[PDB]
Amino acid sequence: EWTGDSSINYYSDEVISDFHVGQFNRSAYFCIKTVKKSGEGTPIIACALSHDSKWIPSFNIMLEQARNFYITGHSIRVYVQPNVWSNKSFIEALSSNALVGLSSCSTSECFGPVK
Amino acid sequence: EWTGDSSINYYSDEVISDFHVGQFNRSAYFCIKTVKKSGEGTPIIACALSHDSKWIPSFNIMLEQARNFYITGHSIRVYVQPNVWSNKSFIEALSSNALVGLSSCSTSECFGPVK
Amino acid sequence: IDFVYRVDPNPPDVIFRDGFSLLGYNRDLQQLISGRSCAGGSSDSRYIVTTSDINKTYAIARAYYSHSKFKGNLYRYKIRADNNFYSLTPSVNYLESQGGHFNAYEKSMIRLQSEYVSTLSILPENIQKAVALVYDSSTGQIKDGTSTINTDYVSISSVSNPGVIPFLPEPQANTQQRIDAFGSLISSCFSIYSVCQTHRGQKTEVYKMPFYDARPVIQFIISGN
Amino acid sequence: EWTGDYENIGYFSHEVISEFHVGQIDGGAYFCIKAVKADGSRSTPLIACSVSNESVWAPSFKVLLEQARYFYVTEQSVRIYYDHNVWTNQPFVNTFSTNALVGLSSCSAATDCFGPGKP
Amino acid sequence: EWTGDYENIGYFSHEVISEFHVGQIDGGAYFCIKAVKADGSRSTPLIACSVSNESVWAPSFKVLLEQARYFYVTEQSVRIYYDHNVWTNQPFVNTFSTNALVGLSSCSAATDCFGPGKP
Amino acid sequence: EWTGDYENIGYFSHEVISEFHVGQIDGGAYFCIKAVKADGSRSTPLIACSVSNESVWAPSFKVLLEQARYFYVTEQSVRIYYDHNVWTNQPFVNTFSTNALVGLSSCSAATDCFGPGKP
C-alpha cells in the first residue's frame, strides 16, 4: 500500500479549516476538514486512527503534519482513502475517508504523487 | 468507546484559559480550564490521565492538542465525560470530567461529532 | 483596558517632556504583529505598542538586561489608555472577516503579547509615572525602583477603545512571513527602537536588540516533539 | 501520590521560569528550572528538578519538561509544584536543590492560579 | 554507515526546503522534501525521502523529519545530505526520487556550511 | 555519570548555538552543534555532538536535542556541558569533534549561568 496508489484520491490546493481529535475504540484519532481556498464548496473530511486500518504506521507523522499545516494555513494536498472507516456513527459524524497523505501545494504545481 | 458517544458531553465556542500539568498516582495528567470565547458561563474543567481510565490511548494526542489550542487561543469545542475521576481531593481541586475530545470551533459551526 | 505599560531607556524627564512618537506611517496590522513595520524590519510603524501586563514589562527588562551588550537604565512608563488605544484582537478578527489570514503563529504571538496599540503619539499627559528597573548583578533580577510621578498627568479616567483600528490597510495575501521576537517571545514592537528614539536631535544610542524568528519557537512549544 | 497533595507538596504561585538547564545524571535525562517572581520581591530563587529515571515523579517528567519549556520560552506566570527532599545526590543537591518539580499550572491574572491549592 | 561518508553520500548546500510531503508506503511512514537553491529557482530541485521502516537510514527517520519540519518552518539555508539509489519502488521513484534523506545541516551566511563536506 | 561532574565534564558559558547538524552514524541518529561566543569575541567555536545509540550519554539524547534546537532557534546565550574524548570514529571526529554534548543551561548575562559549575 502507498498514498500514491490508484485507490487513493487526493484533493489539491486545500487548506485545513477544522481540526478534531478524540478516541474511538481504544484508538486515538484525528479528523481534518479542509476546504478549497476562496471557498469552492464541498469540504473534505479525512480521519486517521492510531490503532485501526492499514494506515496505522503513518498516524503520528500524519497528525504532526496536519497540525503544522493547520497552524500555517498553507495550501496543501490531502490524500485520502475512501471507505476505510465502517462505524456508521463515525461515518455520519465525520467521514469514511482515511487521511493517508499530506503534501505542500506551492501554487505553481503541488508536491507529491499525482495521476 | 468514542468521543461522539451519547455519554459524552461537549461545550462549544470555548477557549482554554488555564493549563495545569501534574502527576496523580503513577500517571501524568493535564487539566484544562476553558471559558466561553463570548466571555460568559461557568468554566469547564476537564482532565486527562496518562495511565488511568479508558481514555489512556488518547492522552498524548489530547495533551498535544490542548497545548496547541491553549497557546493559539483558538475557539474550540471540548468533549468531556463526567464522573470519570473518583479521587475526591482531585475532584474538588480540578474536576471529575475526563477530557476525551477537542475540535476546532469556527464563527459559524464547530467540527466533530454532535449530539 | 486602562493603564498600559511601556519600557523605555530614556529617563522620566525626557519622556514626560516628549512622550512617545510614532515611528512612521505604516498602518498595516500584519506587519506590526509580525514586526516587519517595527524596529526589526521597515521601522515605520504608525502604532505605539504597549502592554497591559506588568509581567511583559518585566520580561522586556529581563531580555535587555540579560543581553549584556545593553548599557543604561530602563523605565516602565504607566500610560493611561484613552480612546486611541486599541486591542489587537478585534482588529485581527475584522481583518480575518475581510479576507485576511492570520496563522496560528500570529494568534499565539498576539495572545502572548497582551498588546495594545496607540494609533496616535502617546502624549505626556497620558503617562502616570516612571518606575526605574534596577538590574542588580547579585541575583540577576529586575527590581522596581524609584517611582517618578508625572506632574502633567491629567487623570481623564478614560479606557482603551474596544473597537477596531480605523483605516486599516487591506489585508495582504498570506505569505507565511517571519515574526520578529526577542527575549522570551516578546514581540519586536516592544523593543527600544520600535518607537521614535529621536528627542529634539538627542537620539538615544543603546544596544540594537537582535530578533529571532518567533515561528520556530511557537512551533517548538505547540508540539513538544 | 499526587501533585495536589498540599501536605507534602509545596508550590509557589505567580512565578516565572527564569533559567532552564538540561543534563544527564546516573543514566537518566533530567531538567532543572530556576524560577523567580516576575517582580523582584521574593529575592530567593526556587530551583526544581525532574529526573526521568529516578524518584516517584519520573512518570510526569516528559510532560513536565514540555510544559516547563513552554513556561520558559514565554515567561508566562506559572504556579510551580515541587516536592522537597527528593534528590539525594550530594553534588546534584548542592548544585540545584532537593526539590523535585512535580507540577505546573498557568497563573492567569495576579490573584488566582489554576490547579490544586491549599485550603 | 554515516551521513558524512562523502564517498557514498552526496549533499547540496545552501538549499531551502520548498515542498514537504508525508505519507505511508509498504507499512512505513515516509516523508519527502523538495529543496531548491536558496537564491531563487537556481539548479534542479533535489528530492530526498526518508522511510521509517525501510533501508539502513531508518534509525534517523524521526530526527531528520523533525529537523526537516523546522527547516521548513524557518525557510532557512540548509545543506541536505542524501544517499542515491536507496529507494527501489518504481512508482515511488518516478514520483519523488531514489534519494534517501540522510542528513540536514544549517547553513549560516553567504558561503560556509556546517557538517561534513567533500575535501 | 553526571552532567555536573566538573572533574570530567567541561563547559563553556555564554555560548550561542550558531550551527545545527543532524544525521545518522553506525545505525544511530546524532546531532552536532557548533557554538560561538555570545559576545562575538575572538574564540575557536565548540562543536558538541550527541549520538542516540552510542556512549553513556545516549539517554539524554532526545531531551538535549530538542533543547539544543530551541537554543539554536532563539540564539539564546547558553552554557554547553560537553564530555571530551567520547567519539572515536576518525572521520566523525575530524569532521566535528570528540566532544559529547551532555548538558545545556541558560546564561543570564554577566558570568552567572544556571546549572553546575566549578567553584
mmCIF file with all atom_site columns, N, CA, C and O in Angstrom, chain D residues 94-114:
data_model
loop_
_atom_site.group_PDB
_atom_site.id
_atom_site.type_symbol
_atom_site.label_atom_id
_atom_site.label_alt_id
_atom_site.label_comp_id
_atom_site.label_asym_id
_atom_site.label_entity_id
_atom_site.label_seq_id
_atom_site.pdbx_PDB_ins_code
_atom_site.Cartn_x
_atom_site.Cartn_y
_atom_site.Cartn_z
_atom_site.occupancy
_atom_site.B_iso_or_equiv
_atom_site.pdbx_formal_charge
_atom_site.auth_seq_id
_atom_site.auth_comp_id
_atom_site.auth_asym_id
_atom_site.auth_atom_id
_atom_site.pdbx_PDB_model_num
ATOM 1  N N  . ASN D 1 94  ? 23.687 20.083 46.080 1.00 0.00 ? 94  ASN D N  1
ATOM 2  C CA . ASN D 1 94  ? 24.427 21.319 46.298 1.00 0.00 ? 94  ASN D CA 1
ATOM 3  C C  . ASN D 1 94  ? 24.383 22.213 45.070 1.00 0.00 ? 94  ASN D C  1
ATOM 4  O O  . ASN D 1 94  ? 24.399 23.442 45.195 1.00 0.00 ? 94  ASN D O  1
ATOM 5  N N  . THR D 1 95  ? 24.328 21.617 43.878 1.00 0.00 ? 95  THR D N  1
ATOM 6  C CA . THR D 1 95  ? 24.159 22.408 42.667 1.00 0.00 ? 95  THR D CA 1
ATOM 7  C C  . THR D 1 95  ? 22.763 23.014 42.593 1.00 0.00 ? 95  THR D C  1
ATOM 8  O O  . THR D 1 95  ? 22.608 24.241 42.582 1.00 0.00 ? 95  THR D O  1
ATOM 9  N N  . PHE D 1 96  ? 21.731 22.174 42.530 1.00 0.00 ? 96  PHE D N  1
ATOM 10 C CA . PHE D 1 96  ? 20.402 22.713 42.276 1.00 0.00 ? 96  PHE D CA 1
ATOM 11 C C  . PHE D 1 96  ? 19.530 22.820 43.519 1.00 0.00 ? 96  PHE D C  1
ATOM 12 O O  . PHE D 1 96  ? 19.261 23.924 44.002 1.00 0.00 ? 96  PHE D O  1
ATOM 13 N N  . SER D 1 97  ? 19.129 21.670 44.064 1.00 0.00 ? 97  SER D N  1
ATOM 14 C CA . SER D 1 97  ? 18.170 21.604 45.161 1.00 0.00 ? 97  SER D CA 1
ATOM 15 C C  . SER D 1 97  ? 17.860 20.155 45.507 1.00 0.00 ? 97  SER D C  1
ATOM 16 O O  . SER D 1 97  ? 18.326 19.235 44.831 1.00 0.00 ? 97  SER D O  1
ATOM 17 N N  . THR D 1 98  ? 17.073 19.947 46.557 1.00 0.00 ? 98  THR D N  1
ATOM 18 C CA . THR D 1 98  ? 16.395 18.678 46.773 1.00 0.00 ? 98  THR D CA 1
ATOM 19 C C  . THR D 1 98  ? 14.992 18.667 46.181 1.00 0.00 ? 98  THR D C  1
ATOM 20 O O  . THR D 1 98  ? 14.318 17.635 46.236 1.00 0.00 ? 98  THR D O  1
ATOM 21 N N  . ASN D 1 99  ? 14.546 19.785 45.614 1.00 0.00 ? 99  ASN D N  1
ATOM 22 C CA . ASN D 1 99  ? 13.172 19.919 45.154 1.00 0.00 ? 99  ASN D CA 1
ATOM 23 C C  . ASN D 1 99  ? 12.963 19.173 43.845 1.00 0.00 ? 99  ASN D C  1
ATOM 24 O O  . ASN D 1 99  ? 13.711 19.362 42.882 1.00 0.00 ? 99  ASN D O  1
ATOM 25 N N  . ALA D 1 100 ? 11.939 18.330 43.815 1.00 0.00 ? 100 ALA D N  1
ATOM 26 C CA . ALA D 1 100 ? 11.506 17.668 42.594 1.00 0.00 ? 100 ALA D CA 1
ATOM 27 C C  . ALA D 1 100 ? 10.364 18.475 41.994 1.00 0.00 ? 100 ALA D C  1
ATOM 28 O O  . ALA D 1 100 ? 9.369  18.738 42.672 1.00 0.00 ? 100 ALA D O  1
ATOM 29 N N  . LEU D 1 101 ? 10.513 18.875 40.737 1.00 0.00 ? 101 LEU D N  1
ATOM 30 C CA . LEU D 1 101 ? 9.411  19.517 40.035 1.00 0.00 ? 101 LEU D CA 1
ATOM 31 C C  . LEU D 1 101 ? 8.324  18.485 39.774 1.00 0.00 ? 101 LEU D C  1
ATOM 32 O O  . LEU D 1 101 ? 8.544  17.512 39.047 1.00 0.00 ? 101 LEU D O  1
ATOM 33 N N  . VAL D 1 102 ? 7.157  18.682 40.382 1.00 0.00 ? 102 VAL D N  1
ATOM 34 C CA . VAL D 1 102 ? 6.067  17.719 40.286 1.00 0.00 ? 102 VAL D CA 1
ATOM 35 C C  . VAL D 1 102 ? 4.834  18.284 39.604 1.00 0.00 ? 102 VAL D C  1
ATOM 36 O O  . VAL D 1 102 ? 3.945  17.504 39.230 1.00 0.00 ? 102 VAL D O  1
ATOM 37 N N  . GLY D 1 103 ? 4.735  19.597 39.427 1.00 0.00 ? 103 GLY D N  1
ATOM 38 C CA . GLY D 1 103 ? 3.560  20.136 38.771 1.00 0.00 ? 103 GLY D CA 1
ATOM 39 C C  . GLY D 1 103 ? 3.770  21.545 38.275 1.00 0.00 ? 103 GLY D C  1
ATOM 40 O O  . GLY D 1 103 ? 4.598  22.295 38.797 1.00 0.00 ? 103 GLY D O  1
ATOM 41 N N  . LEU D 1 104 ? 2.989  21.903 37.261 1.00 0.00 ? 104 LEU D N  1
ATOM 42 C CA . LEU D 1 104 ? 2.993  23.248 36.710 1.00 0.00 ? 104 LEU D CA 1
ATOM 43 C C  . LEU D 1 104 ? 1.568  23.636 36.354 1.00 0.00 ? 104 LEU D C  1
ATOM 44 O O  . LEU D 1 104 ? 0.813  22.824 35.816 1.00 0.00 ? 104 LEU D O  1
ATOM 45 N N  . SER D 1 105 ? 1.202  24.875 36.664 1.00 0.00 ? 105 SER D N  1
ATOM 46 C CA . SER D 1 105 ? -0.092 25.399 36.261 1.00 0.00 ? 105 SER D CA 1
ATOM 47 C C  . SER D 1 105 ? 0.075  26.836 35.800 1.00 0.00 ? 105 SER D C  1
ATOM 48 O O  . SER D 1 105 ? 0.967  27.549 36.259 1.00 0.00 ? 105 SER D O  1
ATOM 49 N N  . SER D 1 106 ? -0.782 27.251 34.879 1.00 0.00 ? 106 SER D N  1
ATOM 50 C CA . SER D 1 106 ? -0.776 28.633 34.431 1.00 0.00 ? 106 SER D CA 1
ATOM 51 C C  . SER D 1 106 ? -1.416 29.533 35.479 1.00 0.00 ? 106 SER D C  1
ATOM 52 O O  . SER D 1 106 ? -2.360 29.143 36.173 1.00 0.00 ? 106 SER D O  1
ATOM 53 N N  . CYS D 1 107 ? -0.887 30.747 35.597 1.00 0.00 ? 107 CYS D N  1
ATOM 54 C CA . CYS D 1 107 ? -1.396 31.744 36.535 1.00 0.00 ? 107 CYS D CA 1
ATOM 55 C C  . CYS D 1 107 ? -1.927 32.924 35.728 1.00 0.00 ? 107 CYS D C  1
ATOM 56 O O  . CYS D 1 107 ? -1.215 33.901 35.490 1.00 0.00 ? 107 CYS D O  1
ATOM 57 N N  . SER D 1 108 ? -3.185 32.828 35.306 1.00 0.00 ? 108 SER D N  1
ATOM 58 C CA . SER D 1 108 ? -3.854 33.944 34.657 1.00 0.00 ? 108 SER D CA 1
ATOM 59 C C  . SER D 1 108 ? -4.304 34.938 35.719 1.00 0.00 ? 108 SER D C  1
ATOM 60 O O  . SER D 1 108 ? -4.951 34.554 36.699 1.00 0.00 ? 108 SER D O  1
ATOM 61 N N  . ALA D 1 109 ? -3.940 36.209 35.527 1.00 0.00 ? 109 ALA D N  1
ATOM 62 C CA . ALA D 1 109 ? -4.155 37.280 36.496 1.00 0.00 ? 109 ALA D CA 1
ATOM 63 C C  . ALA D 1 109 ? -3.302 37.063 37.741 1.00 0.00 ? 109 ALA D C  1
ATOM 64 O O  . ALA D 1 109 ? -2.936 35.929 38.067 1.00 0.00 ? 109 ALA D O  1
ATOM 65 N N  . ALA D 1 110 ? -2.980 38.146 38.445 1.00 0.00 ? 110 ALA D N  1
ATOM 66 C CA . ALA D 1 110 ? -2.055 38.083 39.570 1.00 0.00 ? 110 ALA D CA 1
ATOM 67 C C  . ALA D 1 110 ? -2.717 37.655 40.872 1.00 0.00 ? 110 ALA D C  1
ATOM 68 O O  . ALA D 1 110 ? -2.037 37.607 41.903 1.00 0.00 ? 110 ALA D O  1
ATOM 69 N N  . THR D 1 111 ? -4.011 37.343 40.859 1.00 0.00 ? 111 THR D N  1
ATOM 70 C CA . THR D 1 111 ? -4.721 36.982 42.078 1.00 0.00 ? 111 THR D CA 1
ATOM 71 C C  . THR D 1 111 ? -4.951 35.485 42.229 1.00 0.00 ? 111 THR D C  1
ATOM 72 O O  . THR D 1 111 ? -4.876 34.972 43.351 1.00 0.00 ? 111 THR D O  1
ATOM 73 N N  . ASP D 1 112 ? -5.218 34.769 41.139 1.00 0.00 ? 112 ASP D N  1
ATOM 74 C CA . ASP D 1 112 ? -5.566 33.358 41.208 1.00 0.00 ? 112 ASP D CA 1
ATOM 75 C C  . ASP D 1 112 ? -4.727 32.553 40.226 1.00 0.00 ? 112 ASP D C  1
ATOM 76 O O  . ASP D 1 112 ? -4.319 33.050 39.173 1.00 0.00 ? 112 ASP D O  1
ATOM 77 N N  . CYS D 1 113 ? -4.474 31.299 40.588 1.00 0.00 ? 113 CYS D N  1
ATOM 78 C CA . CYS D 1 113 ? -3.784 30.348 39.732 1.00 0.00 ? 113 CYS D CA 1
ATOM 79 C C  . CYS D 1 113 ? -4.612 29.079 39.602 1.00 0.00 ? 113 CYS D C  1
ATOM 80 O O  . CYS D 1 113 ? -5.290 28.658 40.543 1.00 0.00 ? 113 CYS D O  1
ATOM 81 N N  . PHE D 1 114 ? -4.553 28.476 38.419 1.00 0.00 ? 114 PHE D N  1
ATOM 82 C CA . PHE D 1 114 ? -5.238 27.219 38.176 1.00 0.00 ? 114 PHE D CA 1
ATOM 83 C C  . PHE D 1 114 ? -4.547 26.089 38.934 1.00 0.00 ? 114 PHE D C  1
ATOM 84 O O  . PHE D 1 114 ? -3.400 26.206 39.371 1.00 0.00 ? 114 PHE D O  1
#
